Assembly symmetry: C3
Homo-oligomer: 282 residues x 3
């Protein structure tokens, strides 16, 4: 039987930094000197509270703003609400999450669970256009009790024309073995719409990307249109019914894929081999 | 317990006008001299019939065309089907709605319920491009029996680059008190795609925007891509789990928000105060 | 009672050709000299295996690549995986499908059923941009056991600015009689986003486009945003609740419809008449 998320409700503390990278980009990290683009994954259970002690190490104002989760206005990360951070300064942002449940009026309160993201809101413009462009974004996962847990989670961000702020024809590639349970967090940012496509695999267009049983009528898809600040996620069994292989993923807007914004889901046999893929050639 | 829609099935009569506004725009109204952009909300119960006596007060042909509802071809509001209205003229359009139910072949007929809209179809071009651009659009809500009813309904239209045909940096803003049940009808028009985003609140991506219970697998979101003539709607509890505040909503396409196509969901305490928002400054 | 799909699980064999058409386009067909744009419909039941003996009759490399269905890497139809076909050559592609079911870990494997499509992947560029532009695309339907079957299926492809590679103002038009069960496969290709809209009819935004009963919360819509390589499908009862008529369908992006990328769903009475439509005028 698969591993499932437990009941949430813990108070968690975390340290985060925004830093200026040597190449001109901007990144978040849990440790000074280890910023990354995309920023590190934040994963919690519904009911958890997260206190993020955030330090802006840059020479310009920056902030941390989150989609989906609960936060008071003092943590929305905007200049308007006095919620951003001065150069060199520190601020504690508080994000909360809640379980679903019956309200007193008989209606159903939705829970926080889902695939979300955080990003800057004050670098370059008052909507963080420069910070987002430079790499100040990252994924957030909120698990409902009983959600299936993966072997591994990969984050794919279509940021303007780039994937994860990388140059054309440099992936990123991800690797799995046939049978691995692989999770994908898909995020889009910037100016353009895109269509995310994966070869050889498919998922359900609902909250978790998977179907619990025969009664769920959601569309099963391998192609999905997205726009700036859209986020969704899903799980696949690597190679299920299709075998090992170098399975492309890409934006399917034809000029975008033609520019080289493509990557590989390298699904291996146990011996590491991939049919039709020769390592000493890529 | 919350208020819910009753069983429908009434014949309703209504008067509507299309008018040329002093500033060059075009608007619908229920009373001559009270046209608005967006046009007034039309709200009915599944099963209702609506007879709209429509007068074109303009000096060009205009029409009324509706999404989603039942209408015979004599009420589709197009030039091709002889269904538009000459300058100064009057025409009675008939819109019908139906409840869902079992067909004789055992399949399930969907009902009319949902978030829809009406707009012009002959001003400027034979697809109403000029009429839509000038402001001839408005919302329609069809309620299913038992649908939860809100305290108030607001209409947000992304029309080309504008929100509700307003200049940049002029909202519109909407107001609520913490705990109000607020309904949003979201409509998009024109040439461009957008992504609607609200700070501090979220909803379900299904027919009503809310979940009835734990079995609904729909994605819970705060960001949604839309295109011309898309319509959706939802309800939120103002400030639920997040408190009072000036909560932004905006298109999240970065250049669109940078141009100032943003507004505020001003959620107040009972005393009218909003933390971090000073009235004598906006 | 309506006709429903039976249990699948047959091995099917098929012959397909890619050909260069006299007007400069490129098309797939089941018979040499009978290529079409869109290519012919491939329709199977979940569990079926399809062996397609594909001959490239053109003077450039071409391939066959499919969305959604199961295929080993030797049938993905790409140059990278040595899976395309040389001029004049032949290759057998194998597509498989599977039923949904319970995995050993207790989770639910989704089935192949849905609305999918096939297209070229090596003409013009290594993502088939030229082949797709020239007309190398077609629809695939995979039926689940018990899926409702239509009287007829029509394929509408928004390919760049064209519908089905046709010039503006040339449809295509489709015909039905009031009460026919009509299926639409909607596919989008190329560079642009679109919004598909039909007058006088609506469908459910889920896997099959129809609701099985009162518990399905999916949005009922008549307008839907799409991007390159998106596919969805649905069924309608022609004229249900609205009667005979020339019911437009079009992209609702205003400049796209203004250019003439529109068609007619001609719903007739038994005597062939259509109110407000005069044949000797179109
Ligand atoms: Cu914002
Ligand atoms: Cu793209
Ligand atoms: Cu593909
Ligand atoms: Cu955002
Ligand atoms: Cu129309
Ligand atoms: Cu926008
Ligand atoms: Cu936000
Ligand atoms: Cu319309
Ligand atoms: Cu591909
Ligand atoms: Cu279009
Ligand atoms: Cu319409
Ligand atoms: Cu494709």
């Amino acid at each position: 039987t698969a591993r499932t998320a437990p009941a949430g409700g813990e108070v968690r503390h975390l340290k985060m930094y925004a830093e200026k990278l040597a190449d001109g980009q901007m990144g978040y990290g849990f440790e000074k000197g280890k910023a990354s683009v995309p920023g590190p994954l934040i994963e919690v259970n519904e009911g958890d509270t997260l206190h993020i002690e955030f330090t802006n190490t840059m020479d310009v104002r920056a902030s941390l703003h989150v989609h989906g989760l609960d936060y008071e206005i003092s943590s929305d990360g905007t200049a308007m609400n006095k919620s951003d951070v001065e150069p060199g300064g520190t601020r504690t942002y508080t994000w909360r999450t809640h379980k679903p449940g019956r309200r007193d009026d008989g209606t159903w309160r939705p829970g926080s669970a889902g695939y979300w993201h955080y990003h800057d809101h004050v670098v370059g413009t008052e909507h963080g256009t420069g910070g987002i462009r430079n790499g100040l974004y990252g994924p957030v996962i909120v698990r409902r009790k009983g959600d299936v847990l993966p072997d591994a989670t990969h984050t794919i961000v279509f940021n303007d024309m780039t994937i994860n702020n990388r140059k054309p024809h440099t992936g990123p590639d991800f690797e799995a073995t046939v049978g691995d349970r692989v999770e994908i967090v898909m995020i889009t940012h910037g100016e353009y719409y895109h269509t995310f496509h994966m070869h050889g695999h498919r998922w359900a267009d609902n909250r978790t990307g998977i179907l619990t049983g025969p009664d769920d009528p959601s569309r099963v898809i391998d192609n999905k249109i997205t726009g700036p600040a859209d986020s969704f996620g899903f799980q696949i069994i690597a190679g299920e019914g299709v075998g090992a292989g170098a399975w492309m993923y890409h934006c399917h807007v034809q000029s975008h894929s033609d520019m080289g914004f493509v990557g590989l889901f390298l699904v291996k046999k146990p011996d590491g081999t991939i049919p039709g893929y020769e390592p000493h050639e890529h």
